[PDB]
């Protein structure tokens, strides 16, 4: 999911692919000044990428609309304490679904125990694992 | 930078949903249908596959100019020494 | 030692190339001998040195520069490949105990046994994991424990498994 | 394939800027030697000597006569011996490393789209009345029958035939292929790609429709991934004996295919020689 | 000798996987990073 | 000469060990003063060796 600001007039710009096809884009609304210490406010933006094309493909065979709402916390969210009592509450992403203001979570979600326990997933659409990354190399010894 | 290692616990991705909403059955069927039309592979090769970088975990280091400075230095020092040695030999021949 | 670091055809091609270069140098003497040019070309590559076969003016000169370069390249490319092949020799199995998965599920081409009715059979039975290895051993096992060493030294067996001290003595004494 | 990637490895050592300095130093030293000798030795008959000396001296040349020139050509000889030793050492180091290549990519290839208009006729083994055949039938149909001409025998017989003189190809499920290639005699079988497949749909457990057992079984299965026992079970009963890095190829023959750039340089050389001959002939007539 | 110096000199500071000795053994010059309270952290927090 | 200077390079890869004598019985460790240096060995008292 690529994010880029809207083009002054409010309409997203035009771009082409390697095959010269226009990339599908939506009017995506995430809070401004993603830093948590600032008074974040809504600013219309442009969101476009893999998952967006997937949902567009879903639309053409389901006859339904959509209005993208970007997260207001910037996190996936896990089972955490409510910070008021011993009750554990959902934060981050899945809470936005669970409260009243979301219906599909098209995003880099991932299957596990608790999240599948509290909501019903679908069949997976990618089989990515978990891996590790380091830095590359450079030339070597023998000096003089 | 590059990614190394093997793959430990391997979950999958997935479009989430609510509990007992009318869409779930049809959205799962649509995902399953589209996964058998090359669509997932098509979009993967369209977006996640224009990787210009290459690993090429081979080809040990090639000798750069850090292992030849000494030899050129001794060549230059020899030239400098011979410059004076020519005059020394000329003077020795003239005296003798 | 002959063609094996080189392809079985490259030698005749390099011979044809030496002859071609020699005859071209011999027939480039009209700008203002055949045996001498042949000798010089046949010699420079072989690195022997016979005859003062100097070349002509400014054409066989550059031809000689490049000919010497090619000869050096070939000669110095032989040694690199031969050294690589020799370094990459000496293969073997060198079983690292039970950790090697080969004997954890081996074929009948790999043989390994032990003495019958000893404690090792009891230990192998007390293992839900290596049942197939136990069956493979039970296919052919020796009743005695002294003829097993002779059988191994006769190469009918080559993976005898047995306790420590006897093995240490029999290996420190019998060289093979 | 037991192949070593050595297309133009002959020029691999000595990163391609030290040769320019070699030439510059050669010319400078030749000019210096001529100038010293001044105070039948021209200024062209010295580059010949020094080039031959740098290149495993074999052609007769004319040595200088001054003592200083003698000491200088001796120093140049030291340079040449050091340079040649280092070059051959690095060539030996370079030729060691060669592991494998990728013969073909996935299904998207004109190689797979060449049933007959190609090299001697090809085939790809498939198991009859299987899910793969129906999937490819829904997919590209030219490979189903027009290219899917030579149907193979069963799972073991097909792999044996590929190990035999047929050796066309094989299309089948990913997990069984990975297991079978993992534990086999030798290392003659590998799966191309190994992590980029076209119809990822996984295995699973089926239950009667609308039974009500789905929640508990699903949660139990997803809990197993939580504490990671499935990895232990797979490594116990899926990991084979092969697939532990690689060592080398060490192509003994090193045929003309891998060693050809030297002959290209030699061809450029004879072209330059003919050009110089023509130029001299033209400029010497007027 | 130079050949021996140019064939066996390659550093191998590579982490093989979750069983790498440098990974299981805690270190200060070989730190590893993750993401704040996500689906990767819960997997480790489940396994003591 | 080429095959020689290649095989000699093949010989300069293997290094065996730096092993030493075995057991607690050797002149190098029999008398603490009957050696080239004054050997002040490591033997922590109040332990197995001390008894």
UniProtKB/Swiss-Prot annotation, chain B:
How the protein is affected by changing residue 70 to R? In NDHMSD; loss of glutamate-gated calcium ion channel activity
Described by its record, this protein's role is as follows: Component of N-methyl-D-aspartate (NMDA) receptors (NMDARs) that function as heterotetrameric, ligand-gated cation channels with high calcium permeability and voltage-dependent block by Mg(2+). NMDARs participate in synaptic plasticity for learning and memory formation by contributing to the long-term potentiation (LTP). Channel activation requires binding of the neurotransmitter L-glutamate to the GluN2 subunit, glycine or D-serine binding to the GluN1 subunit, plus membrane depolarization to eliminate channel inhibition by Mg(2+).
Transmembrane stretches in the record are: 67-90
Q: What is known of its domains?
A: A hydrophobic region that gives rise to the prediction of a transmembrane span does not cross the membrane, but is part of a discontinuously helical region that dips into the membrane and is probably part of the pore and of the selectivity filter.
Q: Which organism is it from?
A: Homo sapiens (Human)
Q: Glycosylation annotated at which residues? A: 26
Under the subunit heading, UniProt states: Heterotetramer; the NMDAR subunits are modular and harbor tiered domains that function in concert to regulate opening and closing of the cation-selective ion channel pore. Forms heterotetrameric channels composed of two GluN1/zeta subunits (GRIN1), and two identical GluN2/epsilon subunits (GRIN2A, GRIN2B, GRIN2C or GRIN2D) or GluN3 subunits (GRIN3A or GRIN3B) (in vitro). Can also form heterotetrameric channels that contain at least two GluN1 subunits and at least two different GluN2 subunits (or a combination of one GluN2 and one GluN3 subunits) (in vitro).
Modification after translation is described as: NMDA is probably regulated by C-terminal phosphorylation of an isoform of GRIN1 by PKC. Its phosphorylated state is influenced by the formation of the NMDAR-PPP2CB complex and the NMDAR channel activity.
Q: Which domain of life is it from?
A: Eukaryota
UniProtKB/Swiss-Prot annotation, chain D:
Query: What does the UniProt record say this protein does?
Result: Component of N-methyl-D-aspartate (NMDA) receptors (NMDARs) that function as heterotetrameric, ligand-gated cation channels with high calcium permeability and voltage-dependent block by Mg(2+). Participates in synaptic plasticity for learning and memory formation by contributing to the long-term depression (LTD) of hippocampus membrane currents. Channel activation requires binding of the neurotransmitter L-glutamate to the GluN2 subunit, glycine or D-serine binding to the GluN1 subunit, plus membrane depolarization to eliminate channel inhibition by Mg(2+).
Summed up, the tissue specificity of this protein is: Primarily found in the fronto-parieto-temporal cortex and hippocampus pyramidal cells, lower expression in the basal ganglia.
What's the effect of swapping residue 59 to G? Answer: In DEE27; severe phenotype with early onset seizures; gain of function mutation; results in neuronal hyperexcitability; the mutant channel is not inhibited by magnesium and has increased calcium permeability compared to wild-type
Location of the region described as Pore-forming in the Swiss-Prot/TrEMBL record: 45-64
PTM note says: Phosphorylated on tyrosine residues.
| Gene for this chain | GRIN2B
User: Mutating residue 137 to H leads to what result?
Assistant: In MRD6; decreased protein abundance; decreased localization to the cell membrane; changed glutamate-gated calcium ion channel activity characterized by increased glutamate and glycine potency
What ranges are annotated Cytoplasmic (topological domains)? Answer: 55-68
The source organism is: Homo sapiens (Human)
Protein family:
Belongs to the glutamate-gated ion channel (TC 1.A.10.1) family. NR2B/GRIN2B subfamily.
Q: What is the protein name stated in its UniProt record?
A: Glutamate receptor ionotropic, NMDA 2B
Residue ranges annotated as intramembrane: 43-54
Q: How changing residue 94 to V affects the protein? A: In MRD6; uncertain significance
Regions of this protein lying in the Extracellular compartment: 89-260
Spans through the membrane? 16-36, 69-88, 261-276
- Per the record, where is site Functional determinant of NMDA receptors? 56
User: Glycosylation annotated at which residues?
Assistant: 2, 129
- Localization: Cell membrane; Postsynaptic cell membrane; Cell projection, Dendrite; Late endosome
Annotated consequence of substituting residue 90 to S: In DEE27; uncertain significance; changed glutamate-gated calcium ion channel activity; results in increased agonist potency and mutant channels activated at lower glutamate and glycine concentrations
Swiss-Prot record, chain F:
* PTMs per UniProt: Phosphorylated on tyrosine residues.
Q: What is the effect of changing residue 11 to V?
A: In MRD6; uncertain significance
In terms of domain of life, where is this protein from? Answer: Eukaryota
Give a brief account of the tissues where this protein occurs.
Answer: Primarily found in the fronto-parieto-temporal cortex and hippocampus pyramidal cells, lower expression in the basal ganglia.
Binding residue positions for L-glutamate: 48-49
The reported effect of residue 10 to P is:
In MRD6; uncertain significance; changed glutamate-gated calcium ion channel activity; results in decreased agonist potency and mutant channels activated at higher glutamate and glycine concentrations
Q: What is the effect of changing residue 40 to C?
A: In MRD6; decreased protein abundance; no effect on localization to the cell membrane; no significant effect on calcium ion transmembrane import into cytosol; analysis of agonist dose-response curves for glutamate and glycine are not consistent
Compartments reported by the entry: Cell membrane; Postsynaptic cell membrane; Cell projection, Dendrite; Late endosome
Positions bearing carbohydrate: 46
Question: Its biological function?
Answer: Component of N-methyl-D-aspartate (NMDA) receptors (NMDARs) that function as heterotetrameric, ligand-gated cation channels with high calcium permeability and voltage-dependent block by Mg(2+). Participates in synaptic plasticity for learning and memory formation by contributing to the long-term depression (LTD) of hippocampus membrane currents. Channel activation requires binding of the neurotransmitter L-glutamate to the GluN2 subunit, glycine or D-serine binding to the GluN1 subunit, plus membrane depolarization to eliminate channel inhibition by Mg(2+).
Which family, according to the similarity comment? Belongs to the glutamate-gated ion channel (TC 1.A.10.1) family. NR2B/GRIN2B subfamily.
Q: Supply the name of the protein.
A: Glutamate receptor ionotropic, NMDA 2B
Q: Which organism is it from?
A: Homo sapiens
Gene that encodes the chain? GRIN2B
Parent sequence residues shown: 643 to 693 of 1484
